[PDB]
Amino acid sequence: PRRTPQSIPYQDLPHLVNADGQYLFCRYWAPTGTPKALIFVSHGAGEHSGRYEELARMLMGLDLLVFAHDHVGHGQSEGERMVVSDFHVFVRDVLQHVDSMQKDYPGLPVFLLGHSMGGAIAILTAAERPGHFAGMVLISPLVLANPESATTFKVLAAKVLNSVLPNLSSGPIDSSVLSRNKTEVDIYNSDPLICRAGLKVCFGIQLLNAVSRVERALPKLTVPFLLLQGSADRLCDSKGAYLLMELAKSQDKTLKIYEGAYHVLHKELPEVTNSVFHEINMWVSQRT
């Protein structure tokens, strides 16, 4: 019997099969009635759909049907951990899952919510179906490579390394930079479904593919979006959020900055987390 990397059978778990025959674990948060709209939740690197529990519960509370899967190589889905053949696998797999739910709930609007790498995936998802999605919620999305370590030299070097040692990794990224809320850094550090191993060069390069593709997609992007960004984010610099507001052609685009906040705004200090949930609530309410 096919098992998750944690050794639980796929027979017992909500799942789907991708174009490459891999099993992706699925979560659903369905309202009692016929829902107003659908929203797919797109998690980031090293994490999984289960971290979106509170956000999903709140969005179901608004009569939306929330759905998600664990990306290839993440959480309860198959694949070598935090590697991907090409970054477009993540996007293809979101579009597979979206098309399936729309056949089941036709003539409904569909939204995207993405954080970090998941925001990159949300943007590329909407860029490939221009005019299809009703709205996009981005929490500190990946849009921009850190400029000190994205030099002509350090990219070529990365590519040369990839061709010899694709599995070569740097240290684990200091997880203290995720959130000022030390409880949430402790919850991250003790969740068995999170991969905290160092990033491999082959994955490093696919994240640069994502950055390049997001930046080239920004000028042709017209989907409504809410963008939430922390000023002291050491993983996705606040500059990238400003760039998204400059280059996107979307007529309906809103930026909120959280002064002094780190990367995981939905798991930040309660003052920030509550404002984040409230603003996602308000923005989705008005557009449904």
Ligand X SMILES: O=C1N[C@]2(CO1)C[C@H](C(=O)N1CCC(COc3ccc(F)cc3Cl)CC1)C2
Interface positions with ligand X (CB under 6 A): 44-47, 51, 115-117, 142, 145, 178, 199, 204, 207-208, 211, 235, 263-264
Closest distance between ligand X and the C-beta of residue 3, in Å? Answer: 24
Closest distance between ligand X and the C-beta of residue 188, in Å? Answer: 6
Among 42, 49, 77, 116, the one annotated catalytic: 116
Taking the least distance from each CB to ligand X, the nearer of 101 and 187 is: 187
**Contacts by 270-274, CB closer than 8 A, 24 or more apart:** 270/181, 272/230, 273/181
* Annotated catalytic residue 233: yes
Closest distance between ligand X and the C-beta of residue 233, in Å? Answer: 10
Closest distance between ligand X and the C-beta of residue 81, in Å? Answer: 14
Taking the least distance from each CB to ligand X, the nearer of 37 and 45 is: 45
Taking the least distance from each CB to ligand X, the nearer of 15 and 266 is: 266
Closest distance between ligand X and the C-beta of residue 212, in Å? Answer: 10
From residue 218, how far is each of 27, 126, 181, 245 by CA, in Å? 29, 10, 32, 9
Of all residues in the shown chain, the one whose CB is closest to ligand X is: 44
23-29 vs 64-69, strand pairing mode? antiparallel
Taking the least distance from each CB to ligand X, the nearer of 77 and 116 is: 116
* Annotated catalytic residue 48: no
- As a dihedral over the C-alpha atoms of residue 113, residue 223, residue 129, residue 216, rounded to 10 degrees, the angle is -90
From residue 282, how far is each of 68, 121, 265 by CA, in Å? 21, 23, 16
Among 15, 48, 115, 263, the one annotated catalytic: 263
Taking the least distance from each CB to ligand X, the nearer of 59 and 65 is: 59
Among 70, 233, 237, 238, the one annotated catalytic: 233
Residues with a catalytic annotation lie at 116, 233, 263
